[PDB]
Write an enzyme that holds these catalytic residues in place. Sequence first.
Site, PDB file in Angstrom:
ATOM      1  N   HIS A  82       0.864  -1.174   0.000  1.00  0.00           N
ATOM      2  CA  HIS A  82       0.000   0.000   0.000  1.00  0.00           C
ATOM      3  C   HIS A  82       0.902   1.225   0.000  1.00  0.00           C
ATOM      4  CE1 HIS A  82      -0.377  -1.817   4.088  1.00  0.00           C
ATOM      5  NE2 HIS A  82       0.063  -0.678   4.519  1.00  0.00           N
ATOM      6  N   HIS A  84       2.221   2.987   2.558  1.00  0.00           N
ATOM      7  CA  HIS A  84       2.716   3.435   3.866  1.00  0.00           C
ATOM      8  C   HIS A  84       4.211   3.349   4.108  1.00  0.00           C
ATOM      9  CE1 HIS A  84      -1.486   3.026   6.056  1.00  0.00           C
ATOM     10  NE2 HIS A  84      -1.351   4.235   5.533  1.00  0.00           N
ATOM     11  N   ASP A  86       5.898   1.906   5.712  1.00  0.00           N
ATOM     12  CA  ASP A  86       6.239   0.510   5.892  1.00  0.00           C
ATOM     13  C   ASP A  86       6.235  -0.309   4.610  1.00  0.00           C
ATOM     14  OD1 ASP A  86       3.518   1.187   7.206  1.00  0.00           O
ATOM     15  OD2 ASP A  86       3.445  -0.853   7.797  1.00  0.00           O
ATOM     16  N   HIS A 145      -7.018  -2.596   5.632  1.00  0.00           N
ATOM     17  CA  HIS A 145      -6.174  -1.783   6.544  1.00  0.00           C
ATOM     18  C   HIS A 145      -5.990  -0.409   5.946  1.00  0.00           C
ATOM     19  CE1 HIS A 145      -2.359  -0.565   8.452  1.00  0.00           C
ATOM     20  NE2 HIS A 145      -1.815  -0.543   7.257  1.00  0.00           N
ATOM     21  N   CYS A 164      -0.648  -5.949   5.322  1.00  0.00           N
ATOM     22  CA  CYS A 164      -1.237  -5.286   6.467  1.00  0.00           C
ATOM     23  C   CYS A 164      -2.744  -5.488   6.542  1.00  0.00           C
ATOM     24  CB  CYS A 164      -0.972  -3.799   6.559  1.00  0.00           C
ATOM     25  SG  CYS A 164       0.710  -3.431   7.079  1.00  0.00           S
ATOM     26  N   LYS A 167      -3.232  -9.694  10.327  1.00  0.00           N
ATOM     27  CA  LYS A 167      -2.588  -9.532  11.611  1.00  0.00           C
ATOM     28  C   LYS A 167      -2.088 -10.901  12.051  1.00  0.00           C
ATOM     29  CE  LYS A 167      -4.464  -5.378  12.520  1.00  0.00           C
ATOM     30  NZ  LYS A 167      -3.798  -4.191  13.033  1.00  0.00           N
ATOM     31  N   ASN A 176      -3.474   0.730  13.317  1.00  0.00           N
ATOM     32  CA  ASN A 176      -3.633   1.987  12.693  1.00  0.00           C
ATOM     33  C   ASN A 176      -4.599   1.957  11.515  1.00  0.00           C
ATOM     34  OD1 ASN A 176      -3.608   4.262  11.171  1.00  0.00           O
ATOM     35  ND2 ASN A 176      -1.462   4.067  10.467  1.00  0.00           N
ATOM     36  N   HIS A 206       3.084  -6.947   9.662  1.00  0.00           N
ATOM     37  CA  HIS A 206       3.630  -6.742  10.971  1.00  0.00           C
ATOM     38  C   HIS A 206       3.198  -7.962  11.802  1.00  0.00           C
ATOM     39  CE1 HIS A 206       3.233  -2.169  10.213  1.00  0.00           C
ATOM     40  NE2 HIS A 206       2.244  -2.670   9.509  1.00  0.00           N
TER      41      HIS A 206
END
EC number: 3.5.2.6
Length: 230
Positions: A82, A84, A86, A145, A164, A167, A176, A206
């Site tokens: 995406h 981000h 990250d 997300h 993301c 999970k 977030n 993550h």
Amino acid sequence: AQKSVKISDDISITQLSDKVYTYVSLAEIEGWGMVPSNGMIVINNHQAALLDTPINDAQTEMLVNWVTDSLHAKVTTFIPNHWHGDCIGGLGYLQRKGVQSYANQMTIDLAKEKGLPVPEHGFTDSLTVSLDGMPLQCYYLGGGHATDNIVVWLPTENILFGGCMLKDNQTTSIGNISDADVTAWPKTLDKVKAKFPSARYVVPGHGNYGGTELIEHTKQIVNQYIESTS
Ligand SMILES: CCCCc1nc2ccc(O)cc2c(=O)n1Cc1ccc(-c2ccccc2-c2nnn[nH]2)cc1
Ligand SMILES: [Zn+2]
Ligand SMILES: [Zn+2]
């Protein structure tokens, strides 16, 4: 059990296959303190595809040299999940090392509006890039997300880069959700569980990696927060 090697101190790789390693890069994503981030390193014939980079260029440039020195692959392809930090947090580095990037078109339009470095190849639903005969199957299964989040499926490896939208089994947190599609996500995972019912590894964006229960787990998280706010 599976090998956990440290490139730096705050940068770890974990080899899930002959042609696929996964790392977690802890860095400081501003506003939350120290977050551990994931990514895939995928090697075919001296060609190295990289599925999301760390928070800045330094660790992008940490992971990219290790994957030289030790795997003797050249990073040549990249795919952010995406927009981000990250995901493309370290794409500034990689376009400079002339790396070829592919992503969701949405994520392309997005980064542009926020002014980030821009991937050069887009797609609207599915896009199968070849790392020399190794299909590296990206798809846009819906927003979660975030709106542009996607998944990458390594057909030869039964490895699914959930991203993301997923999970770990360990967390029960929606994390977030500022650019999320909550009402909408719940049904993305549903599609995702249907398409790769046979995935041996399903790694998140993550948290530690896992199996396909990570899907039913995240869905819950999301319903617990929708059902608990709506
Ligand atoms: C202090 C924040 C929470 C830290 C954390 N720590 C973990 C430790 C171990 C683990 O297995 C999972 C987590 C985790 O999910 N998290 C949650 C976490 C949640 C969101 C973020 C974050 C920060 C900036 C932009 C996007 C995100 C993001 N949040 N969810 N997905 N992506 C980063 C981390
Ligand atoms: Zn994100
Ligand atoms: Zn994230």
